[PDB]
Design an enzyme around this catalytic site. Structure first.
Site, short mmCIF file in Angstrom:
data_model
loop_
_atom_site.label_atom_id
_atom_site.label_comp_id
_atom_site.label_asym_id
_atom_site.label_seq_id
_atom_site.Cartn_x
_atom_site.Cartn_y
_atom_site.Cartn_z
N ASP A 8 0.85 -1.18 0.00
CA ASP A 8 0.00 0.00 0.00
C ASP A 8 0.89 1.24 0.00
OD1 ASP A 8 -2.44 1.67 0.47
OD2 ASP A 8 -1.51 1.94 2.44
N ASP A 10 -0.23 5.10 0.64
CA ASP A 10 -0.48 6.08 1.69
C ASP A 10 -0.53 5.40 3.06
OD1 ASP A 10 -1.01 8.95 2.20
OD2 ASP A 10 -2.93 8.22 2.98
MG LIG Z 1 -2.69 3.07 3.48
#
Ligand SMILES: [Mg+2]
Ligand SMILES: [Cl-]
Ligand SMILES: [Mg+2]
Ligand SMILES: [Mg+2]
Ligand SMILES: [Mg+2]
Ligand code: NA
Ligand code: NA
Lengths: 242, 242
Positions: A8, A10
């Site tokens: 992932d 962010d």
């Molecule tokens: Mg995230």
């Protein structure tokens, strides 16, 4: 055997709402000398460039903006997909037409604009309109909790369209999302499961139910590791890959 | 007789869709030494800054973007109004509801999103949706000429909302505007009338019936002048004020 790390973006490679650091960027480039790396996020390619740099496709073996609907591999576009191409224009219009007519019949204190926001991976539908002010969102969410406006609208939509393979998800104060089944972060897994990886690690910071990492974390094709911050991720990678 | 010159921007001070020339920019600043000057246009403040300069509110005594729904005098923002406060929430929703139900019935090759864009001084309505791609815009535009989609939509709206004080105007390729009677360029005159000017000159390149300068040109409060090009505007100004 051969392995892939999938991150992932962010909150995992970056501090929430922030750009990647030069030191983190350097870490991953050294990690890439040991294991293939890829990134997956819900935002379009432009924001991914803002978060990870404009040369993102050269620094990662895979880049999956929009949960993988846009897909880059070894620096070139592997594949592109969107809801209109997959569902077809006729079904898109049936869904849009039904929502427009439905919203015209909802009695509300206020209606504004952008009732239907069209995104490559979803339609975001709002009875009041996404253009409304924050004050107007709160008024609506208070009426919605008492009258179940969005619950009833989504229920009627599920009865009418879900046989076409559509998932509906309420969220936030004013809107709900319509998208094809499985068009969460798991979508990107189709682009790496053929490339002969014996283990696909996944690192994310929203792995609990409701989080945008939960379905990819839970998928049996990934060895999922929840992380609390980028520093937690880097501590886990030190124990896993030295 | 203290006086004011109000100028349409596009096609009048600038070439169509272009920034003002430095030559015309210097001319208007020399003209300002003899008479207060002001600019009016349907575009928003950002577009006006693109065409005339980021320091526009410093270079012109009045700046009236969005026909004056946003208005600057001597560098400071003036008293403001918006469509929902002038028309009332009930009429706004009847307009929005009618448009949503109508759009649901239009048969188009494609429909996307942002069918209704809520603006300060108007509701902008697109049968295909403002978020459509450029290819989809051209596709709809060519279809609209053949099938008169926007023209029929507007004709039906003029009947349904007769006497409610609304005006409808097709513009561009994909949409039409709905705005209160008088919120065309004439709107800005409320900020300059009975404020000490014996003469309010106005210069515009679309003063013909149907043009976006017609109503301000024909309004009794202005001494209107039709221009055929920026160089024609300069010709008249040299005649009147030199
Ligand atoms: Mg995230
Ligand atoms: Cl809309
Ligand atoms: Mg797993
Ligand atoms: Mg003009
Ligand atoms: Mg006049
Ligand atoms: Na597959
Ligand atoms: Na703008």
């Amino acid at each position: 055997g051969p392995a892939l790390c999938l991150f992932d973006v962010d909150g995992t490679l970056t501090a929430p709402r922030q750009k990647i650091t030069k030191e983190m960027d350097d870490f991953l480039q050294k990690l890439r000398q040991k294991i293939k790396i890829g990134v997956v996020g819900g935002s379009d390619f432009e924001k991914v460039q803002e978060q990870l740099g404009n040369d993102v496709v050269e620094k990662y073996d895979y880049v999956f903006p929009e949960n993988g609907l846009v897909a880059y591999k070894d620096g070139k576009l592997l594949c592109r997909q969107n809801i209109q191409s997959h569902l077809g224009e006729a079904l898109i219009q049936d869904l849009i037409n039904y929502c427009l007519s439905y919203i015209a019949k909802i009695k509300l204190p206020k209606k504004r604009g952008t009732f239907i926001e069209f995104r490559n991976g979803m339609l975001n539908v709002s009875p009041i309109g996404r253009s409304c002010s924050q004050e107007e969102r709160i008024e609506f969410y208070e009426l919605d909790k008492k009258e179940n406006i969005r619950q009833k609208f989504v229920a009627d939509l599920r009865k009418e369209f879900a046989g076409k393979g559509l998932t509906f998800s309420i969220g936030g104060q004013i809107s709900f999302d319509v998208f094809p089944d499985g068009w969460d972060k798991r979508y990107c897994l189709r682009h790496v499961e053929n490339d002969g990886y014996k283990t696909i690690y996944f690192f994310g910071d929203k792995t609990m139910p409701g989080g945008n990492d939960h379905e990819i974390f839970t998928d049996p094709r990934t060895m999922g590791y929840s992380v609390t911050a980028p520093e937690d991720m880097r501590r886990i990678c030190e124990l896993l890959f030295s």
